[PDB]
Amino acid sequence: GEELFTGVVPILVELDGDVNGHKFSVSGEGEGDATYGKLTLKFICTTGKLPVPWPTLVTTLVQCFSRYPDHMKQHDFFKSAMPEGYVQERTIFFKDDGNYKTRAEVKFEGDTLVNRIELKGIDFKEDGNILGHKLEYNYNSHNVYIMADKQKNGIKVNFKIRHNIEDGSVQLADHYQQNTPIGDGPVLLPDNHYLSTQSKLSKDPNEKRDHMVLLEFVRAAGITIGTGFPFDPHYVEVLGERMHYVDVGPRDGTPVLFLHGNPTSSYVWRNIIPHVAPTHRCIAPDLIGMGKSDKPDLGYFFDDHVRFMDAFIEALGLEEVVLVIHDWGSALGFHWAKRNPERVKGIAFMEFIRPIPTWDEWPRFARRTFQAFRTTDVGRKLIIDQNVFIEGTLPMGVVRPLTEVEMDHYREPFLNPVDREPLWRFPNELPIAGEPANIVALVEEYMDWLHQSPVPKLLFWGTPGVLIPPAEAARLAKSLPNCKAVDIGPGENLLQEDNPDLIGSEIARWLSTLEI
Ligand SMILES: [Cl-]
């Protein structure tokens, strides 16, 4: 079942349709990778020009390539129906226009997952958005709702597609879907969940025939978060550069310093700060060359971030601090704490920088990618030229699907590809397999200092994690002095995006037990 989807699967799509007496056929082929929920396909019209706009056919033209996270892999009906496959039937109601009626078989034929469909459209106005071709060549992001249909041993699916019309209006296409398996072998009948979808339509500049190129990403969710950033912007001059930081909470007492990593900013602390501000001052700077801080032309090694954070702390006159750190902000926090141990009253850390002795400790699905990130040729193309760390690695570091509002918040500091230099130097500084030896030695030193320190420690971890596997999170919580471990449930690297209420509330509760 799910075993046939561990790699890249070739896809073939063939449709035969009839809309208002207009007959047409479409062929398509490509490849799917359920690990990312990814689809790459090109569809051509084999009978001439399409009598309907291409966006109307997207949903008809293989939801088995959706990415089901591990904690809801028992709700993936589509994969458990393979290789025999399932029958998919739909009735799509275009608002104030016609309707499509489709019937398809999604099955394995040889080594290819093929999707053969019949389509039939009726009652379409000749001057409507569909037959008049008033649809814009784009596509929106939708929520596809799934529930079990134990009578037919299948599922019932409902959602509403929003098609952009060229006059600025929206055409609604109400979807009513039904999937039942082809083979009698038992399948998975899921609880109520949904799929978060996103699609990008484009053209091949060398294709002469009427065609459509499609890139799609789908992620299941809804079986177990504010997007705003209401903080007033603050700036301080640090080594001739301006650095942006959030400053809230009472002015007295021990401040709490929040340190982000790659490729985020203080935006990753937007849902944690409100739990801490009512009792403690919250300081959350944007790293140099990141966020809203100035982006000078540096090599942006870890040492460069050490210089600017040291001068940021002194610029704000901070005496004693509590640290809430994540990813490379944790290496900055532990290193500074090792060098200023009399000024740290507590450390709350999550998915933090540690010496990774072998690549087999790295997430196997992300090993090929991060080894390609750590090259001066392919690595710069991926991160600098193509912005893969923002568009791909970042949404793969969150179990739940990041919305477009949240992605645009992370996209803003790196709209210009020349400013993406810290996005590429950071993964090359990761101490993996003994390289680079200077970071390995530095990280080994603050890990050693941490093991001999009585400072309060609070470790957040998730499953399966990335930097900190669950077994490693359990080992360190036992041997580190005065450590309290918290399991936040499922998680990859940005644990603040999967369970921000548990992180912030436990920190607010843990902060009261310290002497500050
Ligand atoms: Cl990184």
Residue numbers in the entry: 3 to 63, 67 to 229, 238 to 529
How is this structure described in the published paper?
We hypothesized that the ChemoG1 conformation observed in the crystal structure exists only transiently in solution and identified interface mutations to stabilize it (that is, eGFP: A206K and T225R; HT7: E143R, E147R and L271E). SiR-labeled ChemoG5 (that is, ChemoG5SiR) carries all interface mutations and exhibits a near-quantitative FRET efficiency (95.8 ± 0.1%). The fluorescence intensity of eGFP was not affected by the surface mutations. Despite the ionic nature of some of the interactions, the FRET was minimally affected by changes in pH or salt concentration. In U-2 OS cells, the stepwise improvement in FRET of SiR-labeled ChemoG1 to ChemoG5 was confirmed by fluorescence microscopy with a maximum FRET/eGFP ratio of 16.4 ± 2.7 for ChemoG5 that, in turn, was not noticeably affected by changes in the local environment after expression in different subcellular locations.
Here, we introduce a family of designed Förster resonance energy transfer (FRET) pairs with near-quantitative FRET efficiencies based on the reversible interaction of fluorescent proteins with a fluorescently labeled HaloTag. By engineering an interaction interface between a FP and the rhodamine-labeled HaloTag, we developed FRET pairs (ChemoX) with near-quantitative FRET efficiency.
